[PDB]
Design a protein around this ligand. Structure first.
Ligand SMILES: CCCCCCCCCCCCCC(=O)SCCNC(=O)CCNC(=O)[C@H](O)C(C)(C)COP(=O)(O)OP(=O)(O)OC[C@H]1O[C@@H](n2cnc3c(N)ncnc32)[C@H](O)[C@@H]1OP(=O)(O)O
Ligand SMILES: CCCCCCCCCCCCCC(=O)SCCNC(=O)CCNC(=O)[C@H](O)C(C)(C)COP(=O)(O)OP(=O)(O)OC[C@H]1O[C@@H](n2cnc3c(N)ncnc32)[C@H](O)[C@@H]1OP(=O)(O)O
Ligand SMILES: Cc1cc2nc3c(=O)[nH]c(=O)nc-3n(C[C@H](O)[C@H](O)[C@H](O)COP(=O)(O)OP(=O)(O)OC[C@H]3O[C@@H](n4cnc5c(N)ncnc54)[C@H](O)[C@@H]3O)c2cc1C
Ligand SMILES: Cc1cc2nc3c(=O)[nH]c(=O)nc-3n(C[C@H](O)[C@H](O)[C@H](O)COP(=O)(O)OP(=O)(O)OC[C@H]3O[C@@H](n4cnc5c(N)ncnc54)[C@H](O)[C@@H]3O)c2cc1C
Lengths: 607, 607
């Protein structure tokens, strides 16, 4: 019971703030109503708090063991029992397309449900992403491959995404794994891939679908020359699904990691043990990097949501501790050393810390759910009035923030959660130090923060001609320009919005200067990550303020009890964030406006 | 070689070329320790740290200490005990020990530089070795009879602990309930349970351990002022010859499972609970416990800060080495060209930004701890600063919560940039950075949490000091500012100084206003930690600018080769720090100037 959920805040976002319930019971969501949506959330949260979180500690303390002769890993029993609970509930098929056995839902609800698993035992969701991959394979496959995809979903096959080599991590286009075409149309895959999550998974599944990037013999260089291949761990009867002889793809190593230990991260050898790794060209077209980005987009969304889920339970653990921990006198009585001892929530620094954890946790939850409301054309239309093309671009804009800003913030603020526990925070008896360790990776896999910030600026703004960015900017301007109990917050958001506008203009300026002085492009890189974090801070403060506006209406209408307390908390968090976090963007804008290339010209030997 | 990467060059630069500690070497107390010998000592202990000490860094974490309930002892991994012996066989546990106890006299600035190397390589190894230094503190505070015991303890190399914390008394030391009962023969029986005691047992490293234990005599008043300090040895011993005798009634009952620093056994210590009394001797035969124990706390706080700084340094240098060799991607000037030559990642602006962020904070932090150390000796303070003994003590006291709190928080925060530089490989235990991060998370907790550091800095080291020490340091900064390649840095430092002045005035106002409005004091708590961090950033920027000013002189004087590269890097770091770190203090002042008590008035249930 390390895991502390927050269904109340999820439902508040989904229904009171974004109005996702407007599509429930109609059109694609004809057979799922708002009441059923709430029950699913409570139901998955109960499961996550119980059987899923049961093995969170066991997975870390008793991690998988590799047998190098069998090329298999053994997972701890308790974690396998949590996996079966997940499957027994159909939760690995939430959001899956109906024709694959799934229950149709808005993506905003899907990610709200997944948050609970990510918070309770994130590696369990990763192992359980096979059906989601089946659906992507289906959408990209031939009619015949669609039959395989349908079999794989029904049988709950696991799956991996196989890009990375020792020399090709961020630079995916540098991969050397080759594909050799056979007369009958299959391919033989030959190479060694690195850091593959779930490349083996004990006996959780009867098969694993490896989606592998490889370069066909004679194809061009870079990512443009790569193709994507279905490489099953086991050959199988293409009609019935029956498992056949082992295919030539074997795990040859399993890493020892800082955290996320129960997730087997593996070296994957294809065609190196005298058995060919047969692969099938996905969709029988050569378009690998584009096809795989369907998968990368899901991964990046999941990692951000993972980081955010972990910070939320980190905060709630710190809050529960602080409420019961007696230490010291009220500061108003610090001189009187017979004064009553007080619980530490009375101390200002603890309150500063708890409100920092809360505002960022709840602001990040708003960000990923907001992002998810642009992931269905029909929800984007109903809740935002935006057509499908703009909705896809806005979602593409927000993904590197969910991932990049979410991962970095969660990890940083978990520092505060741990500090709230004092020395006990450093003990394994409490979950926070594992939160920190499990979440450090989120800034690295699915593309590093620097790669996130590069994607945001060059592809999601510049190549987009700023359309999505402009749309979101306009929604922030509209909120600022609309009671008067939010006057200070709106003034602080106006400055923050102008600051982010300034950063954007400055970075664009550097880019166009690179028409004349190539070296000027470096300034964009120097400021890329700070720009991303600034936008994320802006979105958090804006969405918190929106939440405060709804909380004010509900308090004015007569909210009582725990509702009153909740809405009061939203008002305090939006105000705190605007006064304590947003002003720093002014300084960041001025730093970005004065970047120079001194640090680039410096001799490497001077570091 | 090892995980540990030393920087003797930066240390010697700080001691000799910047602070001029050598001006006192070779004369008076340091009569028989010349500059050449000091350099040789730094080189020698650095090699010990890089070899035998660092050799068991990983082992101590992967094969951690075990508690044996059969004997109430702790057993340590063999590889670590061997490192400890390398340290004793060289005499490095007598680093800055008084001469009459067998030490070599040396300036504290040199002592802490020597210790930095052990703290970088295997910090627990130094903590276990703090016994001789505790003997010296027992000597200074003890009776004439006890001076003989402490001398015996130093000569035999007995271990030592500082025993304050209880389950209900951590930050609030004064709330401890452990109890001292005076006996007819003038000894005391100590009765109680102390928690989280570092080195409470240590296998067979030593023939005795001296527990220095705070306890409340029956009948004494409340709080810390009612506490006395007691010498409680693990074994009774002959007070004249030192022969080890009967076991004393102080036993370890438990060893904590921690995020990091695993090889440092952290134990529940029970006194008088296992059927034989814990006999203790009133230190100095006076009742002055919390003042006496603070002689020890001061050393512990300096050690933790230096430790955090030591760990950030070797973290940075591991990251830098990795970046120099890792090929990934094309140069940003050739982004579009997917045929462009691949480059090492030091060519990437974000990596260069990350490295210079690590460099400037690591080297800035080293300057701070060594600058602080030049005020710990009256002779050094006079010779290098021209300040007398009283002002030197107040300045040192002002700077300790900076070394500890700002050093603690900064090291852990920037190791994130170190780990990010390795990409996905930073998450592997194969590289030392994830352990650096785990080992240093505690630095913000033990020896007083960051919040306690901040309260001490403001309430005791500034307000009670009536700002004398603070005004002296501010005067040194202003002097450097008033004095042309360093014009911009001076202008940015001038802004930063004004910013910190503002924060000081605003928090003092909040405090003084509390006489008419009690709740006003909360705004001091709300801002105290941010104020501490700002002063830390200001000192880093100032000292780095001082270093660049010396580097300019040396380059103008004709430096070449490796020296030139080093001096160039000092110029780049100072400028980068001034332009990228210091401006954020402007926004922090404005946030501090607008603090309110909304977060204090909010109902706990709205969190
Ligand atoms: C849901 C199913 C999951 C099944 C099992 C998995 C469960 C386990 C979860 C494990 C979690 C994390 C695992 C991982 O880390 S997998 C490996 C992740 N690697 C990366 O993220 C790569 C990081 N590096 C980059 O992103 C680089 O910037 C890169 C894009 C590789 C640079 O290559 P490039 O210079 O060649 O790219 P370029 O800009 O020119 O575009 C080339 C084509 O790539 C497509 N593309 C690029 N960027 C995007 C984005 N953001 N979104 C969609 N598509 C993108 C485009 O096709 C582009 O072509 P065009 O420019 O002509 O359109
Ligand atoms: C070198 C030998 C080491 C051998 C041991 C080997 C192992 C070491 C390695 C282990 C590393 C971890 C070590 C630990 O964690 S030990 C536990 C550390 N605990 C703390 O640091 C306490 C944190 N909390 C505080 O500091 C509180 O602020 C405290 C002061 C305790 C609050 O109590 P209070 O309200 O009663 O304090 P007050 O402000 O009124 O002052 C009371 C008296 O305390 C003395 N004092 C207080 N502060 C200082 C400082 N900075 N410096 C010196 N003395 C201080 C004063 O005597 C004061 O009396 P006066 O006000 O009349 O002067
Ligand atoms: C636990 C774990 C699981 C993983 N699972 C999978 C998986 O299942 N499938 C898979 O395909 N991959 C997987 N990965 C790979 C992961 O996506 C890569 O580690 C990641 O993209 C970073 O690449 P790298 O490790 O080679 O680091 P590098 O690319 O070498 O990064 C080194 C440093 O240089 C920086 N850098 C590199 N190129 C640039 C550039 N052009 N501009 C600016 N900075 C740059 C990086 O930001 C980083 O700081 C996993 C990684 C981990 C840690
Ligand atoms: C690895 C380790 C080794 C240790 N070794 C030793 C040892 O050898 N000897 C020893 O005596 N102790 C030792 N300690 C004890 C350590 O010093 C305490 O854990 C520390 O002082 C914090 O106390 P606590 O754990 O009770 O936290 P708490 O005092 O309960 O604090 C919890 C939270 O409340 C905050 N807080 C508490 N009081 C106040 C206040 N008045 N105002 C504002 N915020 C407040 C803290 O900052 C923290 O965020 C060790 C601790 C650890 C983790």
């Amino acid at each position: 019971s390390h895991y502390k959920s927050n269904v109340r805040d999820q439902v508040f976002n989904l229904f009171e703030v974004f109005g996702v319930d407007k599509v429930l019971g109609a059109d694609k969501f004809s057979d799922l109503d708002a009441d059923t949506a709430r029950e699913m959330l409570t139901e998955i949260a109960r499961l996550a708090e119980g059987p899923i979180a049961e093995s969170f500690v066991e997975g870390d303390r008793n991690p998988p063991v590799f047998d190098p002769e069998t090329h298999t890993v053994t997972l701890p029993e308790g974690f396998k029992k949590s996996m079966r609970a997940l499957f027994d509930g159909g939760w690995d098929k939430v959001g899956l397309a109906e024709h694959l056995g799934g229950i149709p839902m808005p993506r905003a609800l899907q990610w709200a449900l997944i948050e609970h698993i990510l918070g309770a035992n994130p590696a369990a969701y990763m192992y359980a992403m096979g059906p989601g991959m089946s659906e992507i394979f289906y959408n990209n496959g031939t009619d015949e491959q669609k039959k395989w995809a349908t079999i794989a979903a029904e049988r709950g096959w696991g799956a991996t995404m196989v890009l990375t080599e020792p020399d090709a991590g961020s630079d995916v286009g540098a991969g050397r794994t080759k594909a050799v075409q056979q007369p009958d149309g299959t391919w033989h895959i030959e190479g060694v891939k690195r850091f593959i999550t779930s490349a083996d998974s004990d006996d959780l599944f009867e098969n694993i679908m490896h989606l592998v990037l490889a370069r066909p013999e004679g194809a061009g260089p870079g990512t443009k020359g790569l193709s994507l291949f279905f490489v099953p761990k086991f050959h199988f009867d293409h009609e019935t699904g029956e498992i056949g002889e082992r295919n030539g793809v074997f795990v040859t190593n399993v890493e020892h990691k800082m955290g996320l230990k129960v997730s087997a991260t593996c070296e994957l050898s294809l065609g190196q043990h005298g058995i060919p790794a047969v692969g099938w060209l996905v969709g029988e077209v050569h378009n690998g990097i584009a096809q795989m980005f369907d998968v990368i987009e899901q991964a990046r969304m999941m990692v951000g949501t993972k980081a955010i889920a972990t910070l939320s339970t980190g905060y709630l653990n710190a809050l529960e501790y602080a409420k019961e921990r007696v230490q010291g006198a009220d500061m108003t009585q610090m001189t009187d050393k017979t004064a009553p001892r007080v619980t530490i929530t009375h101390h200002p620094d603890v309150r500063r810390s708890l409100m920092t954890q809360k505002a960022y946790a709840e602001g990040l939850r708003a960000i990923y759910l907001y992002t998810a409301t642009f992931q269905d054309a029909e929800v984007a239309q109903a809740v935002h009035g935006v057509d499908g093309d703009l909705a896809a671009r806005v979602n593409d804009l927000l993904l590197p923030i969910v991932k990049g800003f979410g991962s970095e913030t969660a990890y940083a603020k978990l520092t505060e959660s741990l500090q709230t526990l004092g020395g006990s925070g450093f003990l394994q008896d409490y979950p926070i130090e594992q939160y920190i360790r499990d979440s450090k990776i989120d800034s690295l896999y699915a593309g590093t923060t620097a790669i996130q910030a590069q994607d945001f600026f060059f592809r999601k703004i510049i190549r987009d001609k700023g359309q999505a960015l402009a749309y979101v900017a306009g929604e922030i301007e509209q909120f600022i320009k609309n009671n008067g109990r939010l006057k200070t917050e709106r003034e602080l958001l106006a400055t923050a919005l102008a600051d982010v506008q300034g950063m954007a203009a400055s970075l664009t300026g550097y880019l166009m200067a690179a028409q004349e002085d190539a070296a000027s492009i470096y300034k964009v890189g120097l400021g890329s990550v700070r720009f991303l974090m600034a936008v994320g801070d802006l979105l958090s403060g804006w969405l918190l303020a929106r939440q405060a506006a709804v909380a004010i209406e509900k308090l004015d209408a007569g909210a009582t009890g725990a509702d009153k307390s909740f809405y009061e908390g939203k008002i305090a968090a939006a105000s705190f964030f605007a006064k304590n976090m947003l002003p720093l963007l002014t300084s960041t804008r001025q730093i970005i406006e004065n970047l120079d290339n001194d640090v680039m010209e410096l001799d490497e030997a001077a570091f």
